[PDB]
């Protein structure tokens, strides 16, 4: 949280960082930093080191703004930043950026000095790149340049931001749009613009060639998947006000999406079955890392500083798998518990391994069947159009095909899942022969058929 005496938190490479202003009497307040780690002996947290940063001016309204690990450009190394507002109360604000070392020592990289005040749609990227916007005026400043700059395209909001391979830095504020920052301005395999009305936050997964695999979520308390812009795999949320999402691996295929809310609650949902697996409430803050030293990542949940004027109390940690922690002999049975647990997990693993064989055999049988009935391209291509209420479908063909020796047809068939009832489909077939520049020589021989359309537009769609 942001104030002259409040603090903010962060996770980093198996440990946790607390950034707290301390009114240092003589002095204006001083930033004081704790670096702490989970115990696993007492299942508590411990100071492993600290640092600090003295402040010079006699101006209050020093303010933490945000924090994360950012991957400096001069190195390519993940590193923790902090952003400070320094309000001299002259209606003038510095807006410092600092980044801290392994040494527990700081290093400034942007002063940047705005007269007006940002709140913002503020965010931070790879080369220590600040990105912000006051009213419909999108700007960014790097540490390389060190100067205020604006963006070409005008947007509403700039939800996603991050580097992508073969492009450098990219943004997404309008799904139509697809910018750069270097040479401002691909808009090709982006979502349904129908879905453009609803989505408020995005988190991308991966990239191929153009193609991407991407995730979204709407104001409708949803959670969506996209691959090549294909709306597969939607879920639904308990709560409202979807703030944002992250991810966790938690070992082999035990993957999870982890959604915060502005309502101070959250959900964890499993993959291979888009589905809530767990839900938590009141959630002072959230973080994702291997705090243990197990190999894989875990999650931390913080409950409600209502409890104490102390942050690091009131905690819970859980993989959702074999890990769970929080704040008359009975010991003969522990070993059987662990044994049953681990055998269960083993069978889990092997079930996945077996399922795959099932599907493999299925595909084997598909191909075997298709061969069981039995090379050249007897077609070039399909095409089709609407007229007004009479769909038509047609086919351009080849010299391989001769209509003088074979009566031919063109049927249609429907995929019954959409339209789940008996009814017939009738199509009328037409040869069409044409000549191209007579004034051997090209003779075109297309084949096509027609039928009706309003009967089929039943589920708004079909295939």
Interaction residues for another protein, span 110-149 (CB under 8 A): 126
> Contact region for another protein (CB under 8 A) — 225-233, 237-245, 388-396, 424-432?
424-432
Count of CB atoms within 10 A of residue 402's CB?
11
Binding another protein (rule: CB under 8 A), the pick from 188, 413, 436, 440 is 413
Task: Say whether 18 sits in a helix, a strand or coil.
Answer: strand
Kindly tell me which of 9 and 99 has the beta carbon lying closer to another protein.
99
CA 123/CA 374 separation, integer angstroms = 60
When asked if residue 341 is in the footprint of another protein (CB under 8 A), the reply is: yes
| Cβ count near 208 (within 10 Å) | 10
CA 250 vs. chain centroid, Å, equals: 17
Name the token pair of 203: 């988190």
After which residues is the chain discontinuous, taking C to N > 2.5 Å? 25, 185, 209, 327, 374, 439
Q: What are the residues whose beta carbons fall under 8 Å from the beta carbon of 212, sequence distance 6 or more?
A: 189, 204, 205, 206, 226, 227, 228
Q: Is 430 in the site for another protein (CB under 8 A)?
A: yes
DSSP strand pairing (80-86 vs 96-100): antiparallel
| CA triple 141-147-148, angle to 5 deg | 65
CA neighbours closer than 13 Å in the CB half-sphere of residue 154: 3
How close are the terminal C-alpha atoms of the chain, in Å? 52
444: contact with another protein by CB under 8 A: no
In a 13 Å sphere around the CA of 127, the CA atoms on its Cβ side amount to 14
How far, in Å, CA of 253 to CA of 225, rounded?
A: 17
Selected from 355, 378, 443, 444, the binder of another protein by CB under 8 A is 355
Which one of residues 135, 188, 209, 337 is an interface residue with another protein (CB under 8 A)?
337
330 binds another protein (CB under 8 A): yes
**Candidate segments 65-73, 85-93, 175-183, 187-195, binder of another protein by CB under 8 A:** 65-73
By beta-carbon proximity to another protein, the closer residue of 6 and 366 is 366
Q: Does 426 bind another protein (CB under 8 A)?
A: yes
Choice between 20 and 159, CB closer to another protein: 159
The residue from 425, 435, 443, 452 that contacts another protein (CB under 8 A) is 425
- If we measure between CA atoms, which residue out of 284, 246, 249, 288 comes closest to residue 13? 288
User: Of residues 288-307, which lie at the interface with another protein (CB under 8 A)?
Assistant: 290, 292-296
Stretches 117-125, 135-143, 192-200, 416-424: which one binds another protein (CB under 8 A)? 416-424
- Using the 8-state DSSP alphabet, how is residue 237 labeled? -
Nearer to another protein (CB atom), residue 115 or residue 335: 335
Q: Find where tokens 């109390």 sit.
A: 313
DSSP state of 366: H
Binder among 118, 177, 204, 312 for another protein (CB under 8 A): 204
Q: Which of 44, 210, 262, 368 binds another protein (CB under 8 A)?
A: 368
- Window of 146-154, 303-311, 390-398, 455-463 that interacts with another protein by CB under 8 A: 455-463
Site string for another protein, 370-409 (x = CB under 8 A): x-xx-----------------------------xx--x-x
| Under rule CB under 8 A, residue 438 binds another protein | no
- Quick check: 331 binds another protein (CB under 8 A)? yes
Site for another protein in 182-201 (CB under 8 A): none
């Amino acid at each position: 949280m942001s104030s002259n005496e409040q603090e903010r938190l962060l996770c980093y490479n198996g440990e946790v960082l607390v950034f707290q202003l301390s009114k240092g009497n003589t002095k204006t307040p001083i930033l004081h930093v704790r670096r702490m780690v989970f115990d696993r002996g007492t299942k508590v947290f411990v100071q492993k080191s600290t640092g600090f940063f003295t402040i010079k001016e006699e101006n209050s309204h020093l303010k933490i703004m945000c924090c994360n690990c950012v991957s400096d450009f001069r190195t390519g190394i993940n590193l923790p930043y902090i952003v400070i507002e320094k309000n001299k109360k002259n209606n003038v604000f510095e807006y410092f950026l600092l980044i801290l070392h392994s040494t527990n020592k700081f290093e400034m990289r942007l002063s940047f000095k705005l007269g007006y005040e940002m709140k913002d749609g503020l965010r931070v990227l790879n080369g220590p790149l600040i990105l912000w916007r006051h009213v419909k005026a999108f700007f960014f400043i790097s540490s390389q340049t060190g100067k205020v700059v604006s963006v070409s395209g005008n947007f509403s909001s700039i939800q996603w931001a991050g580097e992508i391979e073969n492009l450098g830095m990219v943004l997404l504020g309008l799904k139509e749009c697809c910018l750069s920052e270097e040479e401002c301005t691909s808009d090709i395999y982006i979502i349904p613009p129908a879905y453009s009305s609803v989505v408020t936050y995005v988190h991308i997964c991966a990239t191929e060639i153009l193609r991407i695999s991407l995730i979204a979520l709407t104001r409708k308390n949803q959670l969506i998947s996209f691959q090549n812009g294909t709306p597969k795999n939607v879920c639904q949320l308990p709560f409202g006000d979807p703030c944002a999402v992250q991810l966790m691996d938690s070992g082999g295929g035990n993957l999870f999406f982890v959604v915060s809310f502005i309502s101070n609650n959250a959900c964890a949902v499993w993959k291979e079955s888009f589905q809530v697996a767990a839900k938590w409430e009141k959630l002072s803050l959230v973080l994702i890392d291997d705090f243990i030293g197990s190999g894989t990542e875990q999650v931390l949940l913080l409950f409600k500083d209502s409890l104490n004027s102390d942050c690091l109390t009131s905690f819970k940690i859980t993989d959702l798998g074999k890990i769970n922690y929080s704040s008359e002999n009975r010991y003969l049975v522990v070993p059987p518990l662990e044994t049953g647990l681990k055998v269960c997990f083993s069978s889990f693993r092997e079930l996945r391994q077996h399922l795959l064989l099932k599907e493999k055999i299925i595909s084997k049988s598909y191909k075997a069947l298709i061969n069981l009935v039995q090379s050249e391209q007897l077609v070039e291509k399909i095409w089709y159009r609407v007229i007004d209420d009479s769909l038509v479908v047609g086919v351009k063909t080849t010299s391989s095909l001769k209509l003088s020796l074979n009566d031919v047809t063109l049927s249609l068939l429907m995929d019954q899942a959409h339209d789940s009832r008996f009814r017939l489909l009738k199509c009328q077939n037409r040869v069409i022969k044409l000549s191209t520049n007579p004034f051997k020589k090209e003779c075109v021989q297309i084949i096509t058929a027609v039928t009706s359309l309003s009967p089929l537009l039943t589920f708004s769609k079909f295939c």
